[PDB]
């Protein structure tokens, strides 16, 4: 799937249906609502950082060099710009697990259809399932709801696919 | 504008279903959801569902699941809340709230409806 | 699930005496979208709820400039200047972004003292 569609604004994953009767941007409530509480257990639990405490922390030379002030000015200044770096590779790194997670949901639920449909289907264009039957309304449901039967729509899938063979 | 409109006051018998409607107009019903609020008599606010009128995407709370069923008519722009079963202590007053549809989008119960009381007892 | 701790749930006060309610979250209230998501309400008794502050730092078109919603951590507050009397009433904090939508209990003020 090297396309994003515009149309299916109620979740991300989602199934384009296309009937007799016509055609929908149907999305997968629960890919979509399952990834959704992972991604924002992430970032609420991402902003956690939990800052050292406040250690009432200051000195300086005291006119007698007391470079306690250079050394603790060092260690705050030291601890940040290393925290703040390190914090730059944290939000890198949890993009990247956030993006190569949907593009994981996408091929979840690829495989899902193609599990159901078998072949009762050709796979064609950029993640397509041409049914070589009839895949009703309710049908297309059962495919969502996962609970699509192949044995039914078997036999006249079958005798289309020796037409065209 | 504000037009929330509730149905009137319901008066039951223990397990027997409650059918609440709430219709709204005066504002865009651009698939806008509806979610619904119960407050026990002089007592706390607890969220009972949302519909998506954009989807049919239902969540119920888990505390009541089965029995609450919950409907949208984008034809009239109406909602409607059924409680199958029925006991005395659900007697309480329902409310109802207006509520982004898309999941990915948040909440907004900008407009609030007029609290049906529906009352439960043999 | 989600927990919304009200702390002062009985609060008299007096006209004119900005006081302040509190709302403790269980996990971080923040959503896919960006913003945070605690919409307070006040039902004045015998109405129906009404809309405050629209995530954490948004007004609403009919509220007056005494209502302010703040806080940007799990413990966010509401605090209104001047209190006068329509003020007085009962006030809920908003469903958390977890799906458990989490009103919360309830915080009564009263005219004066």
């Known amino acids: 799937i090297e396309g994003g569609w515009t149309g299916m604004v109620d979740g991300w994953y989602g199934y384009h249906h296309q009937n007799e009767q016509g055609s929908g941007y149907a999305a997968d409530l629960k890919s979509t609502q399952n990834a959704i509480d992972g991604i924002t257990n992430k970032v609420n639990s991402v902003i956690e950082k939990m800052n050292t405490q406040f250690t009432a922390v200051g000195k300086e030379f005291n006119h007698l060099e007391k470079r306690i002030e250079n050394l603790n000015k060092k260690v705050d200044d030291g601890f940040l710009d290393i925290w703040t770096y390190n914090a730059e590779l944290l939000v890198l790194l949890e993009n990247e697990r956030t993006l190569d997670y949907h593009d994981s949901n996408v091929k979840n639920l690829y495989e899902k259809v193609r599990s159901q449909l078998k072949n009762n289907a050709k796979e064609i264009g950029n993640g397509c399932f041409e049914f070589y039957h009839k895949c009703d309304n309710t049908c297309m449901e059962s495919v969502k709801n996962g609970t699509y039967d192949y044995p039914k729509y078997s036999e006249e899938a079958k005798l289309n696919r020796e037409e065209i063979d | 504008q504000v037009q929330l409109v509730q149905s009137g006051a319901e008066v039951k018998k223990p397990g027997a279903s409650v059918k609440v409607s709430c219709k709204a107009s005066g504002y865009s019903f651009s698939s806008y959801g509806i979610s619904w609020v119960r407050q026990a008599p002089g007592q706390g606010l607890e969220w009972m569902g949302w519909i998506s009128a954009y989807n049919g995407n239902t969540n119920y709370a888990q505390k009541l699941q089965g029995r609450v069923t919950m409907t949208t008519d984008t034809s009239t722009s109406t909602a409607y809340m059924e409680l199958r079963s029925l006991r005395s202590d659900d007697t309480a007053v329902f409310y109802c709230?207006?509520?982004?549809?898309?999941?990915?989008?948040?909440?907004?119960?900008?407009?609030w409806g007029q609290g049906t009381l529906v009352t439960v007892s043999s | 699930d989600v927990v919304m701790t009200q702390s002062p749930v009985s609060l008299p006060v007096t006209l004119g005496q900005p006081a302040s309610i509190s709302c403790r979250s269980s996990q971080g209230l923040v959503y896919i979208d960006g913003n945070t998501y605690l919409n307070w309400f006040q039902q004045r008794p015998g109405q129906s709820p009404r809309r405050l502050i629209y995530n954490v730092f948004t007004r609403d078109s009919g509220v007056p400039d005494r209502f302010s919603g703040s806080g940007s951590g799990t413990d966010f507050t509401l605090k209104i200047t001047t209190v006068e009397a329509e003020d007085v009433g009962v006030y809920y904090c908003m469903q958390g972004t977890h799906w458990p939508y989490t009103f919360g209990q309830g915080t009564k003020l009263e005219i004066k003292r």
């Open positions: 709230a207006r509520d982004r549809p898309h999941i990915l989008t948040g909440f907004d119960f900008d407009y």
